[PDB]
Amino acid sequence: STGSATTTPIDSLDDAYITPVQIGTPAQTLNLDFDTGSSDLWVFSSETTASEVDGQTIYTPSKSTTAKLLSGATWSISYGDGSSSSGDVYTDTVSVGGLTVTGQAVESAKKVSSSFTEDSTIDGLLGLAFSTLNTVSPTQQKTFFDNAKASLDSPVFTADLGYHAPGTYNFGFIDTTAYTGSITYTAVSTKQGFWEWTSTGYAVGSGTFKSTSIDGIADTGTTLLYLPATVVSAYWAQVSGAKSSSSVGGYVFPCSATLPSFTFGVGSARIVIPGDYIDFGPISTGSSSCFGGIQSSAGIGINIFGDVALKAAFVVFNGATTPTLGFASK
């Protein structure tokens, strides 16, 4: 089997991408944030504290003839941005782009943190990291991909995120018309539960490529590119007037600037992020100070190849017995 679904930016900055997901019978379609940095499929629901729902579409398990309470199971998650959610668990039928999993754990939120409430466009998350990170207790549950992978034509999914435009998540096949050149595959460590890999270096604009190993994660659920402070300083030094602002929370730059590209290495291959992809717009409405799309990971503990980097590539998440990642230009 295969599936293919369009993923759509939630706003004009590409802050996140939503993908329609069918849950239950009859289908209830929710727009979920596919997140290769986490491993829970959780949704706003009829159980979510009413004051914490503000415009999201909810899953109502009582209206699904295939929903079953997973007795005794609870979940609770905290993300790298400080947001969180928790609740109980149903199993139900879940379909993405024509690919159906029966008995998928659907984690129903009883509580969500304010950042989720305040984002009416995201009805939940669909985790695509390794199932070892799933938070369901006392019996950990499998991700959608883990449940589907034996049925898929090939045990892979691909992320083709758009710049200011829709893109595609495919399951079970590699669309050879969706990229240029060849796909370069690189090793993955699953020891932390992430799609963790090592970039071979970077370049700023037309500058020389610096060969240096940069360990990080491929994370579709993180907006920006978070890299070591040395790398980030080298980038922003090429933007007149750019500076790190402790009050804003990162590098800002004059909105009048033209940003240079940023290149990262995948083996001997190179992925070029155009300068425009690094512009996240005014820090507040009407400001001439703009927020940068490349930020320091120093306070995180891990480097993160988020959407800024991934949207410049066609990305293969190869879930073979020994997982690997593939990157192609497009």
Please work out, in degrees rounded to the nearest 5, the angle formed at the alpha carbon of residue 185 by the alpha carbons of 184 and 187: 145
SS3 237: coil
Q: Which amino acid is at 182?
A: S
Spatial separation of the C-alpha atoms in residues 87 and 76, rounded to whole Å? 7
Q: Does CATH place domain 5-174 in 2.30.30.100?
A: no
The residue behind tokens 């499998």 is: 142
Q: Which amino acid is at 232?
A: V
Closest CA to 4 of 155, 162, 170: 170
In contact, 314 and 179? CB cutoff 8 Å: yes
Instruction: Indicate the resolution in Å.
Output: 1.0
For the segment(s) 175-330, the CATH number from 2.40.110.10, 2.40.70.10, 3.20.20.100, 1.10.565.10 is: 2.40.70.10
The domain spans of the chain are 5-174, 175-330
Give me the DSSP letters along 177-197: TSSSS-PEEEE-B-TTSS-EE
In contact, 185 and 318? CB cutoff 8 Å: yes
Name the experiment that determined this structure: X-ray
Helix H or strand E segment including 308: helix 307-310
- Give me the phi and psi of 21, to 5 degrees please: -135, 130
Tokens of 138: 């006392």
Contacting residues for 284 by C-beta, under 8 A, at least 6 apart? none
By annotation, the residues acting in catalysis are: 35, 199
Spatial separation of the C-alpha atoms in residues 191 and 85, rounded to whole Å? 24
Sign of CA dihedral 140, 88, 218, 8: positive
Q: Which amino acid is at 181?
A: G
Distances from the Cα of 141 to the Cα of 17, 40, 146, 299, angstroms: 24, 8, 10, 30
**Count helices and strands in the chain by DSSP H and E runs:** 4, 24
Provide long-range contacts, Cβ within 8 A and 24+ apart, for 116-119.
Answer: 116/44, 116/52, 116/83, 116/85, 117/52, 117/53, 117/54, 118/54, 119/10, 119/16
Domain 5-174 identical in fold to domain 175-330: yes
Spatial separation of the C-alpha atoms in residues 81 and 203, rounded to whole Å? 27
Spatial separation of the C-alpha atoms in residues 27 and 151, rounded to whole Å? 21
Closest CA to 187 of 321, 303, 323: 323
Helix H or strand E segment including 309: helix 307-310
